[PDB]
Symmetry: D2
Subunit: 244 residues, 4 copies
């Protein structure tokens, strides 16, 4: 099954046409969606005007286990991967625009697998060995996560990082600056301008995101379902662990 997929930026993001999202999509469409999600890191569905607080939650149930019973209304201008201060942080979120500012209000995603891949080999090798402490609850995650479906390596960083374990503060700051700077390099990002009825789904294991706070008092309302994820595994196979 080939969906009608239209890449949005060169290294991340794709719009999927011809699909009305619903709790009654079959296992095949769910699978082609999950595959697009893995390949493109964030996928977009426009015109899901037909969709409702309950029909979104039951679409979401098809992709994983939510963490209406689960649909959260939001009514975040810092680069982050969702909830990384816990061990088994979410694998994905499904986000629907309900009220969209007429100007401003965009979201940007970064591809943390592309960010890893473009590092020179010596720097990849260092990242492979690093651990970082994330806090809001404190958890140690490897800086490089091996993705449990695709096998792709991805940088696990973002604003919940308090320090790189084993380094002085100065060194921690520099090493984080280098690696996070590859994540947010423009080439690794896609920016989406929302219209009501849009739906984005992103793979939280291989992205970061940032909500642009340029819309002043214009109302902006989105509704999110977050899917439960796995404990990350590093390149050497060690698992993330909570510490505080």
């Amino acid at each position: 099954l080939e969906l009608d997929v239209h890449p949005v930026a060169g290294r991340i993001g794709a719009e999927i046409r011809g699909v009305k999202l619903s709790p009654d999509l079959d296992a095949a469409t769910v699978e082609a969606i999950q595959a697009a999600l893995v390949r493109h890191k964030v996928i977009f569905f426009r015109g899901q005007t037909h969709l409702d607080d309950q029909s979104q939650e039951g679409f979401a149930k098809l992709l994983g286990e939510p963490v209406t019973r689960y649909l959260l209304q939001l009514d975040a201008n810092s680069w982050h991967t969702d909830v990384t201060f816990v061990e088994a942080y979410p694998k994905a979120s499904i986000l629907r625009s309900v009220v969209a500012p007429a100007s401003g209000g965009d979201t940007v995603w970064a591809n943390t697998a592309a960010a890893y891949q473009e590092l020179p080999e010596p720097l990849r090798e260092l990242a492979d060995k690093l651990w970082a402490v994330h806090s809001n609850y404190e958890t140690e995650h490897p800086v490089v996560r091996v993705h449990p479906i695709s096998g792709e390596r991805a940088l696990q960083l973002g604003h919940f990082v308090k320090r790189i374990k084993g380094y002085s503060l100065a060194d921690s700051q520099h090493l984080f600056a280098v690696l996070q700077g590859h994540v947010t390099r423009l080439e690794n990002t896609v920016r989406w301008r929302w219209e009501a009825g849009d739906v984005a789904i992103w793979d939280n294991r291989a992205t970061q995101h940032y909500a642009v706070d340029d819309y002043g008092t214009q109302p902006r309302i989105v509704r999110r379902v977050t899917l439960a994820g796995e404990v990350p595994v590093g390149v050497d196979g060690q698992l993330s662990r909570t510490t505080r």
Copy 2:
């Protein structure tokens, strides 16, 4: 005259609909375009598939004085076919361009975007003590050899808006150690490229962008691999920048 203007991001950029760019636009249209340009910093016209090399050039002349190896059949049109580094155009000279008019001839199916940053918005968000510091700084800009000393803050000659004048031609902040120069640049340039002060455009063949080079920087995203990307540009002559205290930029070398 009110053009059909649609802001693209919150702090920068606007698409103008209902206008067919040409050398024959009337005074009211040209004035409203110039006003939108100063207000929005970068403006976009989609669907200009009628606009050819000569017409793009004749249109550009309604906005200013084009400056110049050019596209055949023109005197000023430059072909670009990468600039993935934040900059303000040609700031290593004293009277750098005021504007460019850029048309998409061939646009990659995925990737190829351009981002602009509003350097007036970036100035305005600085805490007051940092604004006051920025108002006193001068920076050396270079192509390395031309070098020019510009004020860090330029007072726009039409709007009076203050704008940071930085980007990748900056060699150093004058009068500071190297370490200090790097830190102060990082702070001020960092405000320029903050996402909130930026607009990203995804090109389609026939799109035209026009930007105010006095109050922007821009960056061409190099994410499109070998997909052809061909754009053609006319650059318009600008003025010698004036700082907050009235002092003028000056070339200091070759």
Copy 3:
């Protein structure tokens, strides 16, 4: 009264010879020591092998009001025997932090164990004027993380009138700036503090005593001596609430 004063580095630090520190030092000598302290920021007295715990505490009371688990047989003497290898001004997470310490070497490593002081008045004075003007307007939050205090980045010294940067490792953030801006501005200003020309390094021998003006210095204890014993004993003197260039006072915001 003119002491026998020998500058150690060009911009900070001076050894004072011919003086035996004690609780009975006369007022003219004490006054001259106070002046030398303000001028030189850290002063050094070698060969004070007669000084014992009680006589150090007694001497210390001549220069100020000691502040207080102390060494036995004293009220205020603190033993440090490890490590403070990070640039700081003492206790700046409180509002009225110490004005001075009097530190005596009891056991000094045969190699290593130095202390370095930086002149934060010299650091301020070397900033280009626009940067001095910015520094004059900044405030920083200092924290022991739990106490936090807002201090101006520039302190006007209450004796000399000299302006001095008030920074170091207790600084959590520069108030009113993003994290990234706070980091860069701290790095610039702290970097002038630790520039080598603004520093003096002392290698300790048992019976050495150093006195420093904590209002116009930072210091760093070099941790290069491994397991060699290092024991020093310190009396800290109470200080005043700092005053900024515009007259505003520091303020504690959490206690």
Copy 4:
């Protein structure tokens, strides 16, 4: 031979007592000085007022091949690293020493390497840098010392960039590794008196001359010894490019 050696800082520097430097020192003494030089990275001889330019150079010829120059250098560097075979050592004598100020600081770039966490040493072992006098040379960031085998960071102010990285990454990586070099624990500061002589191993140090003495006269006289092309951890050699 056991010289009377007195370590100055914890991780670098030693004063050597009871030796009058001259062209006539015996082989046992010269060998012991060379050993102390390699161990301590910089060594100091005080009271060498009997020396003059000729005698300083005769003594220096016992340690290597000269390439006396009379001498502001307040920037951390290793000497002339913009050339491929930069000096192995210098011998520097104080002729006039300011009464206050005028110190020199050395850093031990072998200690700086050793203290890096293992993953960061492994990265450093793989990096190359371009050094320039703006003459440009590519040197490994880690040099394997040809006598002791100790690994040492080869950085300092002649570095223009770390090869293969963006400007931003090069800046940050340099800041990290150079920051370990100049960490106070890896340094020794010397206050000069006329007649003092310092000898340092330019393969495993950097130095900085403190500019705090105003217009006080400061006169030093230096003899520099020729050195070898550096070898990196993988055996590759430095190479001049421009």
